[PDB]
Write a protein that binds this ligand. Structure first.
Ligand SMILES: CN1N=C(C(=O)O)[C@@H]2[C@@H](C(=O)O)NC[C@@H]21
Ligand SMILES: [Cl-]
Ligand SMILES: [Cl-]
Length: 256
């Protein structure tokens, strides 16, 4: 019979996955557009499968609590409720214990998003002061980085983030961006998203450099037969320069 339609889990995240602007409500895959949809289109052709896009119910990428329980996109793969995770899913050692990743299709690092025209120049200045609140998206890889850090400054920053019942954390990037714009708040964010936001919000800027270096990969359940095929597909898109064209399509624009 025809090849089974694969279930792709993802999360609304600009410019990776976005609702296509329309008056008439849209249904199925046509609801979405973005870098990851274009990536899913190319992978779909190379491997030869249809796909059905489903958003993660809790809107989280995935972290494990003190009870060892995962949530978010990672948990969807563990429980075999999705065949692939085509999203900016950060490749992390802790995540590699419970799911598989393709080779990375994009590189990034943690950095700080904040308003322009301030004397804040680093995470040290941010952790050393009191006026400015700061945090990260809840139950993402950036939160996990600070939660697990063994570095003194980042340990203090996590203690600050987890205080007052984690009020410094935000539900998602969009909520975090709005918090930066409307309050005295700095968002610990991955550099690829900062590049997108700062070009379209010329009053914001990146503070300091990268405090780590990671990559995004396609997530699959352990033992998935598609992992190696997906990796081969990513490599083909690199030699063809397609991944570069996709980046420019959804990021490149007029600078501030
Ligand atoms: C870009 N977004 N920012 C994040 C963060 O944790 O800062 C998330 C991270 C993850 O996979 O957890 N990569 C996609 C999400
Ligand atoms: Cl892996
Ligand atoms: Cl590193």
């Amino acid at each position: 019979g025809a090849n089974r339609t694969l279930i792709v889990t993802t999360i609304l995240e600009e410019p990776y996955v976005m609702y296509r602007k329309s008056d008439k409500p849209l249904y199925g895959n046509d609801r979405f557009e973005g870098y990851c949809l274009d990536l899913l289109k190319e992978l779909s052709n190379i491997l030869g499968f249809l796909y059905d896009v489903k958003l993660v119910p809790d809107g989280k990428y995935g972290a494990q609590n003190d009870k060892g329980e995962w949530n978010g996109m990672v948990k969807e793969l563990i429980d075999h409720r999705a065949d692939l995770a085509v999203a900016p899913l950060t490749i992390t050692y802790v995540r590699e214990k419970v799911i598989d990743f393709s080779k990375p299709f994009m590189t990034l690092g943690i950095s700080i998003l904040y308003r322009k025209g301030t004397p804040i120049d680093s995470a040290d200045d941010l952790a050393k002061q009191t006026k400015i609140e700061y945090g990260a998206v809840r139950d993402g890889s950036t939160m996990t980085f600070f939660k697990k850090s063994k570095i003194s400054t980042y340990e203090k920053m996590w203690a600050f983030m987890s205080s007052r019942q984690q009020s410094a954390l935000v539900k998602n990037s969009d909520e975090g961006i709005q918090r930066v714009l409307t309050t005295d708040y700095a968002l610990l964010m991955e550099s690829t998203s900062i590049e997108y936001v700062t070009q379209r919000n010329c009053n914001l800027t990146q503070i300091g450099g990268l405090i780590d270096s990671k990559g995004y990969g396609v997530g699959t359940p352990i033992g998935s037969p598609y992992r190696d095929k997906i990796t081969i597909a990513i490599l083909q898109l690199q030699e063809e320069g397609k991944l570069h064209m996709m980046k420019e399509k959804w990021w490149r624009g007029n600078g501030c």
